Amino acid sequence: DENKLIAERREKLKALRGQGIAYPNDFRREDFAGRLQEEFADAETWTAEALEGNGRQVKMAGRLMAKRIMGKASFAQIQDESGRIQLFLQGAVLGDAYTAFKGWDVGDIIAVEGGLTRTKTGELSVKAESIRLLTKSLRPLPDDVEQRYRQRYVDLIVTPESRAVFIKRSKIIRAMRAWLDNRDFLEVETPMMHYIPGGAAAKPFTTHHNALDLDLYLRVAPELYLKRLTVGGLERVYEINRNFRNEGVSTRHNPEFTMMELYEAYATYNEIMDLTEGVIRDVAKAVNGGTEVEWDGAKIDLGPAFRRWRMDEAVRHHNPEISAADCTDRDALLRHCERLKIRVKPSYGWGKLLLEIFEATVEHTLIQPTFITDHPVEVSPLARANDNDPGYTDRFELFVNGKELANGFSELNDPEDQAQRFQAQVAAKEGGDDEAMHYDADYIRALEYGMAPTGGLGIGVDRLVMLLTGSSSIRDVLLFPYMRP
């Protein structure tokens, strides 16, 4: 079937090469289908007689999506990047080019010039004075669900409503940059290859620089490089770019993902939360015109102030059998974990156990936007310890519809404290932990030069785009998501 159609289109191309240049590049496109549809949307004012009288001429090109051959005259529909428009073709006007049109195929790229009119059913149409083939298609367009991702180039053609998700993705990132730029944050670029993978607990990709005989790591986060800039005196910086994770086969998580990270000297996690909900809410209003969105069935409103809820309080609310004393009591939390069927390791302190209970019993219930605050120090190796209870850190994670969207904290700038935590992570990696951090001596050295007290932030841009576009799957907001071979 399909292999027969392809051969037939190659025979058409073979005859095309004998008549001349089969792939010409000398057509200047000037007009866009969607801009014309908007300009002439009022069919009461722009009747067929009005459009023909106006004398407007257009010069367009697009992919041939449909043909209606009536005999001496035909209709066609083309699609460019902005939308679709009808064409009206008359053999008495177009002559040999009308004969050519009858032989073209859906998928061919054609160019057309002419005036405007409106069909009997109200559709804006080009009255074609001249028409020509620019690119012969050799593969017919489709009339599995994984082919939309292994062939994004096909799906953008036949599901053109998906284009709007990617356009909005671009507007979201641009709105975020304007919001930050207007607040005098400096956008910076830091390396994507690191000597030591740091700044997140994730398994990295490794690569090799052959000339230097040097192993390198694709970054899991830019955090430790960005705080070196804070030390240097770039006191308000951000970066929006890729991180890399070398983890399990997942349909919900891509090995490449886009994060915005930001560092503001002299802020705490209180001000960083303010900033986080401010930029998310304002970007939502800029690209959607309001603060409400429907995501995965949930009706989310970003307008009201986000909730701020301690992790231990949220755990106790959802686990009434846990007392306030139990929250820092490792033996009590083991009992609850066993009771909740939560697999535990012997290296887990009370803080890790509390996080496990939070993940199993709390986080799926956080639908409306909620900052969960004050994470235990055991699970927060880069966050500043709280002044009043050093078993906790001044940290937060933002959840929307049960999903983590951002995380930030008052930054640990005490080099001796940071070195100690680095050493506990090196001890944790020896116990079979593939995600424990490494000791980065050069970063300790930067902190020894002195870093201002600072607040830092990461926003998951892909999940932010999923939320604001109402996309349930990561694969709908990435142009080329990774697919298994």
Question: Which parts of this chain interact with ligand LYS (CB under 6 A)?
Answer: 199-200, 221, 223, 261, 382, 407-409, 411, 456-458
**CB-based contacts of 253-258 (< 8 A; 24+ apart in sequence):** 253/474, 254/462, 254/474, 254/478, 254/481, 254/482, 255/205, 255/482, 256/482, 257/460, 257/461, 257/462, 258/460, 258/461, 258/462
Residue 407 interface partner, choices ligand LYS, a second copy, Cl ion, none, CB cut-off 5-8 Å depending on type? ligand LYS
Q: How far apart are the C-alpha atoms of 478 and 483, rounded to whole Å?
A: 12
Q: Can you tell me whether residue 43 is helix, strand or coil?
A: coil
Cβ 346 to ligand LYS shortest distance, Å: 27
Q: Taking a C-beta distance cutoff of 8 angstroms, is the pair 87, 31 a contact?
A: no
CA dist list (Å): 294 to 233, 284, 300, 468: 42, 12, 6, 8
* Closer CB to ligand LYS, 31 or 394, in the complex: 394
* Closer CB to a second copy, 70 or 211, in the complex: 211
Cβ 449 to a second copy shortest distance, Å: 5
Cβ 22 to Cl ion shortest distance, Å: 4
| Contact letters for a second copy, residues 268-287 (x by CB under 8 A) | x-------------------
Residue 351 interface partner, choices a second copy, ligand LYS, Cl ion, none, CB cut-off 5-8 Å depending on type? none
For a second copy, the binding residue among 157, 342, 367, 419 (CB under 8 A) is 157
Q: Can you tell me whether residue 346 is helix, strand or coil?
A: coil
Distance of CA 193 to the CA centre of its chain: 21
Residue 474 interface partner, choices Cl ion, a second copy, ligand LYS, none, CB cut-off 5-8 Å depending on type? none
Q: Taking a C-beta distance cutoff of 8 angstroms, is the pair 235, 265 a contact?
A: yes
Total chain residues near a second copy (CB under 8 A) = 107
Sign of CA dihedral 7, 9, 15, 17: negative
For a second copy, the binding residue among 47, 57, 190, 368 (CB under 8 A) is 190
Cβ 397 to a second copy shortest distance, Å: 19
DSSP letters for 271-314: HHHHHHHHHHHHHHHHHHSSSEEEETTEEEE-SSPPEEEEHHHH
Residue 479 interface partner, choices Cl ion, ligand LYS, a second copy, none, CB cut-off 5-8 Å depending on type? a second copy
| Contact letters for a second copy, residues 381-410 (x by CB under 8 A) | ---x--x----------------------x
For a second copy, the binding residue among 2, 3, 19, 21 (CB under 8 A) is 21
Q: Which residues between 249 and 268 bind a second copy (CB under 8 A)? A: 249, 255-256, 258, 265-266, 268
Q: Taking a C-beta distance cutoff of 8 angstroms, is the pair 58, 36 a contact?
A: yes
For Cl ion, the binding residue among 22, 93, 202, 436 (CB under 5 A) is 22
Cβ 323 to a second copy shortest distance, Å: 30
Residue 241 interface partner, choices ligand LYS, a second copy, Cl ion, none, CB cut-off 5-8 Å depending on type? a second copy
Cβ 19 to Cl ion shortest distance, Å: 9
DSSP letters for 411-460: B---HHHHHHHHHHHHHHHHTT-TT-----HHHHHHHHH----EEEEEEE
* Closer CB to a second copy, 211 or 325, in the complex: 211
For a second copy, the binding residue among 108, 277, 378, 397 (CB under 8 A) is 108
Q: Residue with the closest Cβ to ligand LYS?
A: 458
Q: How far apart are the C-alpha atoms of 300 and 467, rounded to whole Å?
A: 9
Q: Residue 371's beta-bridge partner residues?
A: 308, 398
Q: Taking a C-beta distance cutoff of 8 angstroms, is the pair 60, 30 a contact?
A: yes
Query: Which tokens is 58 given?
Result: 């257009």
DSSP letters for 202-246: -PPPEEEETTTTEEEEE-S-SHHHHHHHHHHT--EEEEEEEEE--
Cβ 453 to Cl ion shortest distance, Å: 13
Rg (CA), the chain: 29
Q: How far apart are the C-alpha atoms of 350 and 356, rounded to whole Å?
A: 10
Q: Answer yes or no: is 292 a known binding residue.
A: no
* Closer CB to a second copy, 134 or 286, in the complex: 134
Q: Which residues between 437 and 456 bind a second copy (CB under 8 A)? A: 445-446, 448-454
Q: Answer yes or no: is 404 a known binding residue.
A: yes
For Cl ion, the binding residue among 8, 14, 15, 17 (CB under 5 A) is 17
Residues 6+ apart with CB under 8 A from 124: 36, 37, 40, 46, 51, 85, 86, 116, 118
Residue 261 interface partner, choices Cl ion, ligand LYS, a second copy, none, CB cut-off 5-8 Å depending on type? ligand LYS
* Closer CB to a second copy, 31 or 326, in the complex: 31
Residue 288 interface partner, choices Cl ion, a second copy, ligand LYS, none, CB cut-off 5-8 Å depending on type? none
Residue 265 interface partner, choices Cl ion, a second copy, ligand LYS, none, CB cut-off 5-8 Å depending on type? a second copy
Q: According to the binding rule CB under 8 A, does residue 54 interact with a second copy?
A: no
Query: Which tokens is 116 given?
Result: 């405007």
Q: Taking a C-beta distance cutoff of 8 angstroms, is the pair 101, 94 a contact?
A: yes
Q: Can you tell me whether residue 39 is helix, strand or coil?
A: helix
Annotated binding site for Mg(2+): 397, 404
